[PDB]
Design an enzyme around this catalytic site. Structure first.
Site, PDB file in Angstrom:
ATOM      1  N   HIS A 252     -35.300  -9.543 -84.550  1.00 25.93           N
ATOM      2  CA  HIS A 252     -36.673  -9.162 -85.347  1.00 25.93           C
ATOM      3  C   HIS A 252     -37.508  -8.475 -84.262  1.00 25.93           C
ATOM      4  O   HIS A 252     -37.657  -9.030 -83.332  1.00 25.93           O
ATOM      5  CB  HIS A 252     -37.081 -10.163 -86.114  1.00 25.93           C
ATOM      6  CG  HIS A 252     -38.272  -9.856 -86.992  1.00 25.93           C
ATOM      7  ND1 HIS A 252     -38.263  -8.702 -87.728  1.00 25.93           N
ATOM      8  CD2 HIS A 252     -39.282 -10.791 -87.326  1.00 25.93           C
ATOM      9  CE1 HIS A 252     -39.261  -8.833 -88.480  1.00 25.93           C
ATOM     10  NE2 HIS A 252     -40.076 -10.113 -88.283  1.00 25.93           N
TER      11      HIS A 252
ATOM     12  N   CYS B 147     -37.561  -3.084 -89.852  1.00 24.21           N
ATOM     13  CA  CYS B 147     -38.524  -3.961 -89.082  1.00 24.21           C
ATOM     14  C   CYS B 147     -38.942  -3.224 -88.019  1.00 24.21           C
ATOM     15  O   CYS B 147     -40.133  -3.290 -87.627  1.00 24.21           O
ATOM     16  CB  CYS B 147     -37.956  -5.306 -88.848  1.00 24.21           C
ATOM     17  SG  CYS B 147     -36.804  -5.194 -87.644  1.00 24.21           S
TER      18      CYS B 147
HETATM   19  N1  LIG Z   1     -33.839  -5.306 -86.284  1.00 26.67           N
HETATM   20  C1  LIG Z   1     -33.692  -4.948 -87.954  1.00 26.67           C
HETATM   21  C2  LIG Z   1     -34.607  -6.003 -89.017  1.00 26.67           C
HETATM   22  C3  LIG Z   1     -34.508  -7.454 -88.766  1.00 26.67           C
HETATM   23  C4  LIG Z   1     -35.739  -8.019 -89.240  1.00 26.67           C
HETATM   24  O1  LIG Z   1     -36.094  -7.960 -90.030  1.00 26.67           O
HETATM   25  O2  LIG Z   1     -35.533  -9.671 -88.885  1.00 26.67           O
HETATM   26  C5  LIG Z   1     -36.380 -10.412 -89.748  1.00 26.67           C
END
Ligand SMILES: *NCCCC(=O)OC
Lengths: 231, 75
Positions: free
Chosen positions: A129, A68
């Site tokens: 995220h 992400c």
């Molecule tokens: N921080 C790494 C990925 C996590 C993400 O995609 O949360 C939905």
């Protein structure tokens, strides 16, 4: 599982941008949501990190979860349209090739890029995220790699500051968490300030203005010290 | 003494410190009050990032100065 997690650090993101081959930008951490950033203009986008509570816009959807950070950053960069900014051959070739691919297929292609995977990993249960906010024409969009499409937040201009729309959307997102939840991070992608000061410095040098050159040396030195502490 | 730690969200966390306290100590204090480990914390006093083992008095931080907390979270 083959992609590491990435710390919400403006120094890391500045380096990732460079690592992808893109020049002319840096990332600045925001400390408050009322922070005036008029002096940081132009702002090319925002990167926002929060705890996950389970046709002119470029957008890719994630097909791997741990990508992400890179995916949010690339979604932002491929919507940048500015003379300050050169995407570099890797990202331009990626954007050209994936121009008529659907959002998840773009995620697949991004995930298979060895250069991108390399850059990503060179910088690394509640899940946190990253999502991106970017203006495109007269709209402002949230690019959340879990969704199948960009989310239009609002319309802007003529006088308009696009950042008001995005910041409003972010505040309202924060109002969804415990009035005691504080685990968020907000970063702005802005033009390279050192490069800006060096351009101005060479112009004042040519103009014979020693006073302004020295003050620009001071700004540059200040910027370098700040960049060093982020290391 | 008491000093204030402000966050991105606007919250204000108040702490019991003394001017002798290390930054690292202040981070330990934010944990017990908030839950966030020292690892995930950076403290800013207008407007430098503060070094872990280098004391409030060292940074000229007074009774009821306000600091800013930003988060280093793995995404
Ligand atoms: N921080 C790494 C990925 C996590 C993400 O995609 O949360 C939905």
């Amino acid at each position: 599982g083959n992609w590491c997690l990435i710390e919400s650090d403006p120094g890391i993101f500045t380096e990732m941008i460079h690592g992808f081959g893109c020049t002319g930008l840096q990332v600045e951490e925001l400390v408050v949501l009322d922070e005036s950033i008029e002096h940081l203009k132009p702002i090319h986008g925002f990167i926002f990190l929060f705890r996950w509570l389970k046709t002119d816009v470029y957008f890719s959807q994630q097909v791997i979860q741990n990508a992400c950070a890179s995916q949010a950053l690339i979604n932002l960069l491929l919507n940048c349209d500015h003379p300050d900014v050169d995407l570099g051959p890797t990202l331009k070739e990626f954007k050209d090739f994936t121009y008529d691919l659907d959002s998840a297929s773009r995620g697949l292609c991004l995930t298979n890029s060895e250069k991108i995977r390399a850059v990503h990993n060179s910088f690394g249960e509640d899940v946190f995220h990253f999502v991106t906010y970017v203006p495109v024409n007269d709209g402002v969009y949230e690019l959340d790699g879990l969704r199948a499409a960009p989310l239009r937040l609002g319309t802007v201009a003529s006088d308009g500051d696009w950042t008001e729309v995005a910041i409003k959307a972010i505040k309202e997102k924060i109002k969804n968490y415990g009035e005691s939840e504080v685990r968020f991070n907000l970063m702005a992608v802005i033009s390279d300030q050192k490069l800006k000061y060096e351009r101005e410095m060479e112009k004042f040098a040519q103009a014979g203005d020693s006073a302004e050159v020295d003050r620009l040396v001071a700004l540059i030195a200040a910027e370098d010290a700040k960049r060093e502490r982020y290391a | 003494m008491q000093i204030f730690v402000k966050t991105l969200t606007g919250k204000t966390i108040t702490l019991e410190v003394e001017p002798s306290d290390t930054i690292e100590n202040v981070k330990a204090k934010i944990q017990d009050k908030e839950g966030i480990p020292p690892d995930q914390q950076r403290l800013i006093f207008a407007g430098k990032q503060l070094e872990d083992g280098r004391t409030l008095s060292d940074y000229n931080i007074q009774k009821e100065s306000t600091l800013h907390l930003v988060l280093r979270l793995r995404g």
